[PDB]
Amino acid sequence: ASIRDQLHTIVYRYPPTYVLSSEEQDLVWKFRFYLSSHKKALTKFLKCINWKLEDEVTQALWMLANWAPMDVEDALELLSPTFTHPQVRKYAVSRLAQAPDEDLLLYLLQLVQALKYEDPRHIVHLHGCIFPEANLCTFLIQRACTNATLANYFYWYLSIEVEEVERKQDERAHDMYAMVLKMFLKVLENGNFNLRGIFYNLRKQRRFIDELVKLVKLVAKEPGNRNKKTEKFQKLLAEQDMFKVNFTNFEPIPFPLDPEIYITKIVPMRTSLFKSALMPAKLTFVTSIAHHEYAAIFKHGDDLRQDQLILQMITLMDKLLRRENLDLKLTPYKVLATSSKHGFLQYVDSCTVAEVLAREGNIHNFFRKHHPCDNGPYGISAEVMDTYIKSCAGYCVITYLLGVGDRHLDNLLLTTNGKLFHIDFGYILGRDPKPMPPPMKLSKEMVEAMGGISSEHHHEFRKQCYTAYLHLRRHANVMLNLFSLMVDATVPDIALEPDKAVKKVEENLQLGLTDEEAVQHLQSLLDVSITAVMPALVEQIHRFTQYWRK
Amino acid sequence: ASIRDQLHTIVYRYPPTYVLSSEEQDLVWKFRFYLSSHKKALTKFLKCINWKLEDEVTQALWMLANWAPMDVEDALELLSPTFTHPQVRKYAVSRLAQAPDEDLLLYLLQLVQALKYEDPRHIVHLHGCIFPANLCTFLIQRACTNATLANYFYWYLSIEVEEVESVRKQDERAHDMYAMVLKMFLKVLENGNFNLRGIFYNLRKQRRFIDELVKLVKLVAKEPGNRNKKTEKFQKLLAEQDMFKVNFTNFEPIPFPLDPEIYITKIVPMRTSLFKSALMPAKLTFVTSIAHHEYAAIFKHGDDLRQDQLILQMITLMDKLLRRENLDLKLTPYKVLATSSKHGFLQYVDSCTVAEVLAREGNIHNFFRKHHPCDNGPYGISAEVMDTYIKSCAGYCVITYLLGVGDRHLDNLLLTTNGKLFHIDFGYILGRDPKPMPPPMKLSKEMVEAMGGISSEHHHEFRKQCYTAYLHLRRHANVMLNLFSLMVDATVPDIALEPDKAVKKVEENLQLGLTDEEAVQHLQSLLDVSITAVMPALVEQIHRFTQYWR
Ligand SMILES: Oc1cccc(-c2nc(N3CCOCC3)c3oc4ncccc4c3n2)c1
Ligand SMILES: Oc1cccc(-c2nc(N3CCOCC3)c3oc4ncccc4c3n2)c1
After folding, report:
1. Domains (range + CATH), chain B
2. Which residue, A297, A366, B35, B338, has fewest beta-carbon neighbours within 10 Å?
3. What reaction does this enzyme carry out catalytically (chain B) (predicted)?
């Protein structure tokens, strides 16, 4: 009662999923009802009661109903499969309903998956309701209709989900999605003006995509030099009237990738093509207002669902940091897959580090080209350097938590500002083609760019990682919930060892460690990675190795 | 404000010897007058005042007398030469007098050192008193009070009094002073009463015995052969009665110089071995006065152990602090004394040197296993032994590290059957090394393997232990620093090269600046490079990491 209070608070604050204390769940039970007061306790409380099969349920329902209001994130656990019960899911949905729309968007990528979880009966009921002779799905529709950008992402997520059938229960989940998608569209058609308007916009978007897909297929079909493929791409765009849509100009359409931006046309002349063998295209665009141009990318080869989830994760983590009042200048570009084997990727001006290095031997020469200050730490303006150290820190930390693999100098990008970002996300959760990842992913060039291990800045960088680590850990709970829901995603790296995937993210979190311990541990990974990269730190270890041999 | 004290709590509690305090002196001044919070505060207050005014001294003196009484260790700082004042030295001695003999003997090696610093006019005056200030009178008086103290005091003086006759400048001047002190002490004992005369007779015997022992060692070295033939000769000489002014096979009992508490009779000639080391020390057994419990010691003819005794004093003290703390690592801090230089004894703790252990069983585990086997125990080894070894290991790297002992190799570490490990033979201190190199931390692959590789409850446990050990020693810094200050003119070789740097060097290794969290991080880092360079697998892992990037 007196000191055990503290053991409760540590249990409520700390774990996202627990084996422990099933007898102590009964102990939570004893002090539960009285210490109903605070929300996170509620979710843990809901966990134990259900375990005892029958009368517990009725007693817990009242308990829940009276309980201090469950936070939005805790709700993400309830849509998840682990809780089956029908009423609790309703309450979890009530909780989402309380959340504003932006939160809804990120969560939404997860909630679409989250549909896979019951009840099938609900969907069939609604289907029969649209034509004759959970609460959640209906909720998603209603709110999906309420906001147009929201409607767009919803739609696209559904179309990818339905697209193909191939191992056994994937077919049944698919069948469920198709009906939900069809309902959604039918409600738009039955709709008051704004819905009808959003719908026509979706058909507009649909049409546009397929006509561009046909164009791309035609560009791929011709054998080619790299250059002739870009030229053919360019001429094809300019040939208005050999496609149902004419690409040099058409009706203002809201961009699928970024719905709040309308586009009229592409500019053929400006379109350039990317070096990677599966060849991504950059198209310049024209927008409804002040003829602003949008640059985006269209990739025809493979599945962006992975790339996009990882960006959702980054986007989320940046938002959390800034909410913790930390901004490391991460660049989380939007990514959408239209369908498997094609999507758009927001383009942000960048030079691939390898290209920076090819173009200029040193990274600093590069920055000094764009921003010079005479007293500035190195030829550069102080702010550019500072922002570069910051970007690195966030990115190593996230890469670490995400076990992003395959990183190399073509993968890291640099801007004139100094933000550093990562580009390609084929390898996730420790997957790597190479045999042994470094724990942390660092380039000799990047480290020399911080002024080396023996540098003032380099220290600031290290400092930043640690703190980023500590903060990200605090909001462990959201990320884990999202990943729990992303088990059946169809991201390849999740698909190989799905059950295990979430544990892998949590292992990077080292949530078991107290904070001093965590920092030390991360200190370790930096040390090894950095010694590995540096030519002199290795030479030194060698001389130390020598020592004992005589 | 209220913070005034907070800036002050940091000044009184944190630095052991500061150049730093400059302006601070005046603010301390304003506040000391109403409150003398602590014993520790007095050392701090004292630093600023004495030279500057003849009058200042009078105001400070009344402050000091009514001031809360200083802790003994802090007094050592006072005797250190910097404070010139006749009145403060008297104060320091008054504090020492209150301190119990055992603490007093521990420190004494330094006090013998302190004499040079205390003003000579006082010593000549005391001399005048006998044949035809306070500290010297105090050492002689207390020395007479306790026999062991007398014995240690005598030996320390003899070594310093015994001349090189290759004296330059003030060393020429100091010898006469030490010689005078010894002469005075010897005259007080002869003159003194029943008990003092008793001490004098015992010392006469100790002196007579050594010279006779030494004649024998010189005869043995002169004789030609490999180690075994020389040992055979040594054995014969002991047993030859009355070839010497003493009969080694039996004698009148003499208080052992290494432990005054136990007399010996006879050596046992056959029970004597010789060591692998360069100027092979004998071991002897002895008999002793009771139930013939043997004792053994070493006797080393080759070099001056003044330095070895200082290092062991350090370890003896540190162990004491930790046991005080209730952190007990199974440290072995064997008694050395020097004799008058180029002889000494060392207490013998029965141990096998690691190199020996590696040759006799394949590796350390095999060896503990042979002496202490428990099927269920960690490595089939009784739990206790592993634990004593983890701890012995931690205690030693940390202590070795603070003291910058160098030139460690397999001949240099040893084990016990209980598990403990220790070091030995420290010719190199404060980072003198024959090799151009660190490791910053001295570990052997063999020992890491002994802990069952990098991940083990045990290795991790070893690491855990080092940090706790590091923090406690950090806490008790002042005492160590004060003893080194007193050893500036020590005539210990490692100290000599730059006498001033020596105090700075331990202070620096000590790492006092950093917050504990940073101190632990700092220590963790050193262990990590030391361990990677010592494990072959770790180096391969780093190569894989360097190659990731190419
Ligand atoms: O195959 C893929 C999958 C995912 C991303 C890309 C991609 N994105 C890029 N972005 C450019 C800068 O703005 C943000 C996005 C990108 O820039 C490049 N520059 C050179 C080579 C390849 C790429 C490249 N590949 C390529
Ligand atoms: O040059 C020095 C200085 C100080 C100590 C030694 C030394 N001590 C030793 N002790 C034996 C075990 O109990 C503790 C004492 C010692 O044992 C050895 N066994 C083999 C070679 C050298 C030594 C060796 N050297 C050698």
Report:
1. 1-132+134-193 (1.25.40.70), 194-350 (3.30.1010.10), 351-550 (1.10.1070.11)
2. B35
3. a 1,2-diacyl-sn-glycero-3-phospho-(1D-myo-inositol) + ATP = a 1,2-diacyl-sn-glycero-3-phospho-(1D-myo-inositol-3-phosphate) + ADP + H(+)
